[PDB]
Ligand binder design. Structure first.
Ligand SMILES: Nc1nc2c(ncn2[C@@H]2O[C@H](COP(=O)(O)OP(=O)(O)O)[C@@H](O)[C@H]2O)c(=O)[nH]1
Ligand SMILES: Nc1nc2c(ncn2[C@@H]2O[C@H](COP(=O)(O)OP(=O)(O)O)[C@@H](O)[C@H]2O)c(=O)[nH]1
Lengths: 468, 468
């Protein structure tokens, strides 16, 4: 039948939202007959009260997601899917005869940072999976560690790591390469023609089961290849375990990635420590409603060695967990060394293990951590707050949404929408509005974020029946 | 396991609420840097936007309550519970040997109106059910019908309507009356001592099952005795069927009870038609998100014969279903007579069949309609908006709540609250705040309504196993 707690919680969520609406209607009407100081003090007081009121609703929603076996079922179903995908990838990557295997050769040496390079391999991997070719990762002279991938990670194959074959060619399309045994894939920006096995689409054979389980199936798919790629060598597995003990990493803990140095004034903006911490504080207030928070722990990953001292001074009621020598190694002068490589691998590891992630998704470092985080819980798709971009995968196809409720523009900055219009989302402004193009009309501008739904794209991937 | 629609909807409720919070933080920050007419225009625009947003959340919460068979299950369980209770009541009321049966004698001539008098009979009935006494209703000279209860309703017993017995006494307590066959019950104001079988408590053997099904078990329990009492005589049953056809009562329709005449200046205030209609319009806006509303219908029940015309000209886009001659029969100089009794019974009936009820809960007329409504759907506990009181039953024990989140008073009109404090609630101001007494501190004042939860009270009632 129906669960007692499920029904109490659903009714409490309804009633809490109603009480919030009652409160808002009364307070905004009072507010619009004030001025000067009294107007501003009341505005602030309303926001304070709304914060706690909204967090109690979120708290009941968290409980609703777990009652009456839901949490256990979601865990068992997520575990079952990941074991299936990993089992497929492993079968693909370990043919019996390497001399006769179809192969796709990826070169790690894209000229960029660790996250960008890791995502390059993921993109190679996703296309190899889609074309039923064993991924051959060539990583000699990898600028972080010229010994190659196996400096930190397991080889991507136990049986087939050789690039030999009866015929080799540069990628030219799935059909043309039908009978070519070894195909060389370039970086995505040089890829012509593009195949369908790219983010943010998901395999159509997994799409239905994924909706039952995960809030963002596109990231889940990406993360399955990240999971396989970062299988640690024995020594790295030990380094992570030793770091966990030495740093005192324990829960609850919130991860904060503050990207500075060369990202400032090229691809992203400078963000002061206070802009990250408002969301850290907001989230610990949430956690405190459902668990006791002995100590407010923040794992701080940054390429600015001076930030740790600044944060500690400004937030003395927080315990900042952070490896300042790792920060030093991320500086421009030492970035492309093995010591630095392991610094970022560890920072990304602990970022990914946190209960919540606050950062700028414009940085590949945070995206990797967010991606890995998906492999650690049934549905961690919402456990982040980004100060700029929404989730994206460099080289993805167009991210589209579908308008569900009509919108009449109130200013010229807003675009109109009718239920069913394809909206190409460029970003969420985290203020109730997103920016995108209404492809129906060809107009670009702002629209209310709640009035659209995600347009999840599917692709016919192989399902590797033999892997069972 | 978990339903696909259930999970999509829960996540959409979460995101919808997140986006509402993002919107409010942005818009309230903007409001506090505006003044004058500019400030008032933006505040009105924000409220329009918020309304549509809140209803999209409420709509999804509605859909959530129906997915994966929850509606069918809720329907079947509500039917079993009422069939069980009615079967028990019918067993209690119809002993084989009336001359030997324990009886409780109730006199209908409490000096008040029909709703108050019906609830007096409910109060007698409830105490009779708890003490395993057959209810004996004495209704001669009823101010509404000199011929008594059976002028309109069926006798409360088919086998035992005679007050005879070997001993008789005035109420003096279940223990002192253990061996007294016939006990005479006064009105609740003169009841000494009080037994446990009064609202808002519910029977402990039903309490868990009612929480799975119903949002206000106290009203559900009351409604079970109302349902039994208003079983109609043949002439009145046909009268109801003919009024339905003649008035064009069909769905969707919203019931509006406007109580004036002698209630104004004594127990309630005058409320203009506009005040009821804002909530009528708001609920039709909600309904339109999930269904096609061909016409916006209102069943107007009122004791002011001049209102139907004013309402019709003020709301030319609405269809008003009303019996103006019933409104006239309710006039002060002619209210206590059968034709008027018939009028209020039909008015209450149609109010109770509406999809939503807008009224003043300070009027017993609306409370009766709200109670009957609980017997028409699995869970209609929330299908109302009162302009003044919350639900209450005349004579009920103290309605207490339990503070769940702490509260520091911002003004002197508010009371402090700590988790666990017992709060005796006087009312809900429908603005985010309630009024009550923090019984721990002995302070009266205002507190945020969402910070408390309802303290469901249970009583050990007989279960009448023999009734199966
Ligand atoms: N250890 C560590 N290294 C960082 C951090 N932020 C940036 N770096 C270094 O700078 C590089 C940034 O390049 P990339 O991973 O492609 O991410 P992006 O440039 O921020 O988009 C990383 O790979 C690291 O080597 C940090 O918080 N910790
Ligand atoms: N037919 C009809 N009678 C009404 C209406 N409002 C009030 N009355 C009459 O006035 C009485 C009001 O007394 P009561 O039922 O105890 O409720 P209350 O006085 O409003 O709290 C009703 O019982 C009716 O007899 C109405 O809308 N329709």
């Amino acid at each position: 039948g129906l669960g007692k707690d499920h029904e109490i919680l659903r009714r409490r969520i309804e009633n809490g939202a109603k009480e919030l609406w009652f409160f808002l209607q009364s307070e905004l009407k009072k507010l619009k007959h004030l001025e000067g100081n009294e107007l501003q003090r009341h505005a602030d007081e309303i926001l304070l009260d709304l914060g706690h009121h909204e967090r109690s609703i979120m708290t009941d929603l968290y409980y609703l997601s777990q009652t009456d076996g839901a949490g256990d079922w979601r865990e068992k179903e997520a575990k079952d899917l990941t074991e299936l995908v990993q089992r497929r990838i492993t079968y693909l990557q370990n043919p019996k005869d390497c001399s006769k295997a179809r192969k796709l050769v990826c070169n790690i040496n894209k000229g960029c940072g660790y996250g960008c390079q890791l995502h390059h391999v993921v993109y190679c991997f996703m296309i190899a999976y889609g074309t039923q070719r064993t991924l051959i990762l060539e990583s000699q002279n990898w600028r972080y560690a010229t010994g190659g991938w196996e400096t930190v990670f397991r080889p991507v194959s136990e049986t087939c790591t050789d690039r030999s074959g009866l015929s080799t060619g540069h990628w030219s399309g799935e059909v043309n390469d039908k009978n070519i045994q070894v195909v060389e894939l370039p970086i995505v920006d040089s890829l012509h023609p593009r195949p369908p096995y790219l983010p943010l689409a998901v395999p159509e054979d997994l799409a239905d089961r994924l909706l039952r389980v995960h809030g963002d199936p596109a990231v889940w798919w990406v993360s399955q290849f990240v999971k396989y790629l970062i299988r640690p060598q024995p020594w790295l597995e030990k380094e992570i375990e030793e770091a966990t003990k030495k740093l005192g990493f324990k829960h609850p803990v919130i991860g904060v990635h503050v990207r500075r140095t060369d990202k400032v004034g090229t691809e992203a903006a400078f963000h002061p420590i206070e802009e990250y911490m408002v969301h850290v504080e907001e989230h610990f207030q949430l956690l405190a409603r459902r668990m006791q928070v002995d100590k407010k722990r923040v794992y701080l990953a940054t390429d600015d060695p001076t930030l740790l001292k600044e944060a500690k001074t400004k937030y003395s009621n927080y315990e900042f967990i952070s490896d300042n020598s790792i920060s030093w190694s991320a500086g421009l002068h030492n970035r492309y060394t093995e010591n630095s490589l392991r610094g970022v691998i560890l920072d990304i590891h602990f970022l990914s293990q946190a209960d919540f992630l606050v950062c700028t998704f414009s940085s590949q470092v945070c995206r990797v951590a967010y991606e890995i985080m998906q492999t650690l819980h049934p549905d961690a798709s919402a456990n982040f707050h980004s100060l700029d971009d929404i989730y994206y995968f460099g080289g993805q196809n167009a991210h589209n949404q579908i308008a569900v409720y009509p919108h009449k523009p109130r200013t010229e900055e807003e675009i109109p929408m009718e239920p069913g219009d394809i909206i190409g989302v460029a970003g969420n402004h985290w203020d109730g509005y997103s920016k995108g193009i209404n492809r129906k009309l060809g107009k670009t501008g702002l629209y209310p974020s709640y009035k659209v739904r995600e347009k999840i794209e599917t692709v016919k991937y192989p399902t590797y029946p033999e892997a069972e």
